[PDB]
Amino acid sequence: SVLAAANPIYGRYDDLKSPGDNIDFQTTILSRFDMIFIVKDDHNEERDISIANHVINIHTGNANAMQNQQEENGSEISIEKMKRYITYCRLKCAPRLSPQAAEKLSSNFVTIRKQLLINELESTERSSIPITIRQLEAIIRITESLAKLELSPIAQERHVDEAIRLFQASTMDAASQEIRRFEQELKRRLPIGWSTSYQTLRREFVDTQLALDKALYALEKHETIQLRHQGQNIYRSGV
């Protein structure tokens, strides 16, 4: 196993810049990682307060007792016992996928491939973070490892759900990252506090055509619009 740690180009991730400019690594080496995490300082004040209280509890030496209580409570295990347990799992078990797990994984592969295709069209360039058939095998290995914890001789639907969730939380999240006329049209034609049902906006804009969903993503990130009611109602919530 290769566990690697790196900073982006420009050191801090530089969010408004393209990922293809922020990421040094070629798509060849990137594809060899089952999970790519892009880690960012969220700067959220509640989180920062929480981290500050935690880190103070580290430096004060409170954490020495806290970890021991957590271990004796059975909510945590030690370095030594975990080391032996990883060895035992690596020597006892090597699970297969059930047929149901196999189908869910296969359909998930075509789903994420479609997402990458449309994103490459929307950004009109090949993505730096890739999704390839090697990355299906990444989700397969993760599924098997998740079953390998409990020494289950087969992986099951639940393990595939967690494997898919982890891949979505890591490699997809790494991959995930004229309209100016249409947005001011929507601002003109939907005043504050009222709702346009989405499909009518789609018909009107088409009747003038993919600029619609870019406009909605921008206006939803801002306070001006709120996608109420299962996304059916475009609500001019803010300015």
Partner 1 sequence: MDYIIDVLYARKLKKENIVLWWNEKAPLPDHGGIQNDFDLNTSWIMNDSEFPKINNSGVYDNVVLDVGVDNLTVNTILTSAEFVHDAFSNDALNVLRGMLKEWWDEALKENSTADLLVNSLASWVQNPNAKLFDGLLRYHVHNLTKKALLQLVNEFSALGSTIVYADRNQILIKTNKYSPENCYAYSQYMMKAVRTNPMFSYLDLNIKRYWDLLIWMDKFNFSGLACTAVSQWQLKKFLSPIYQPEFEDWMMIILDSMLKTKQSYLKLNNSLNGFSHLFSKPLMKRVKKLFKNQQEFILDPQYEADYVIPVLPGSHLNVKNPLLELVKSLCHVMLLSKSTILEIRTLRKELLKIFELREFAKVAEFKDPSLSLVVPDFLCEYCFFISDIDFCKAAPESIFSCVRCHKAFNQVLLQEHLIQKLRSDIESYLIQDLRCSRCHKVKRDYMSAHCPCAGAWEGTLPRESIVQKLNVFKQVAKYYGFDILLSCIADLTI
Partner 2 sequence: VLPVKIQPPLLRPLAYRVLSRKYGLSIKSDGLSALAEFVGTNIGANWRQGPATIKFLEQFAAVWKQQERGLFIDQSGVKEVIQEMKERLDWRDYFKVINASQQQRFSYNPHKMQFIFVPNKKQNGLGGIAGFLPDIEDKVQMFLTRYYLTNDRVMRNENFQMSITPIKNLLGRDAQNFLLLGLLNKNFKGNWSLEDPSGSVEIDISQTIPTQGHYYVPGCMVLVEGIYYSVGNKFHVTSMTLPPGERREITLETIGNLDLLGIHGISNNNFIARLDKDLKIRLHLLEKELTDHKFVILGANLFLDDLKIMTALSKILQKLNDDPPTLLIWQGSFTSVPVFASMSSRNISSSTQFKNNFDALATLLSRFDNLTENTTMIFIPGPNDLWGSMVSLGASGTLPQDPIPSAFTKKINKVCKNVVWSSNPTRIAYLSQEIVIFRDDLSGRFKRHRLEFPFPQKVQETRKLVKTILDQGHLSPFLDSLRPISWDLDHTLTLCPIPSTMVLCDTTSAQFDLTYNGCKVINPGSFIHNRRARYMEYVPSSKKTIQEEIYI
Partner 3 sequence: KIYPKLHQMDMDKVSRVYADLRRESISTGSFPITVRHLESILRIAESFAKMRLSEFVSSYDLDRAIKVVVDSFVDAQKVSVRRQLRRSFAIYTLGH
Contacting residues toward partner 1, per CB under 8 A: 161, 165-166, 168-169, 172-173, 176, 189-197, 200-201, 204, 227-233
Q: Cα–chain-centroid distance for residue 179?
A: 27
Going by the DSSP 8-state scheme, the letter that residue 157 receives in this structure is H
User: Which of partner 2, partner 3, partner 1, none does 157 bind, CB closer than 5 to 8 A by kind?
Assistant: partner 2
Least Cβ distance, residue 210 to partner 2 (angstroms): 12
Nearer to partner 3, 59 or 188 (CB): 59
Contact in structure between 143 and 155 (CB atoms under 8 Å) = yes
56 makes contact with partner 3 (CB under 8 A) = yes
Per CB under 8 A, 228 contacts partner 3: no
Q: Please, which residue, 81 or 202, has the CB nearer to partner 2?
A: 202
Residue 60 binding partner 3, by CB under 8 A: yes
CA nearest neighbour of 149 among 82, 55, 207, 209: 82
Q: Taking each helix axis as running N to C, give the angle between helix 211-221 and helix 198-206, from 0 to 180 degrees, rounded to the nearest 10.
A: 140
Q: Does 111 bind partner 2 (CB under 8 A)?
A: yes
Residues in the chain: 239
The DSSP bridge pattern shows strands 154-155 and 96-97 to be: parallel
110 binds, among partner 3, partner 2, partner 1, none (CB under 5 to 8 A by kind): partner 2
The reply on whether position 84 binds partner 3 by CB under 8 A is: no
Residues in a beta bridge with 234: 196, 227
Closest approach of Cβ 167 to partner 3, in Å? 28
Cβ atoms of 154 and 95 within 8 Å: the answer is yes
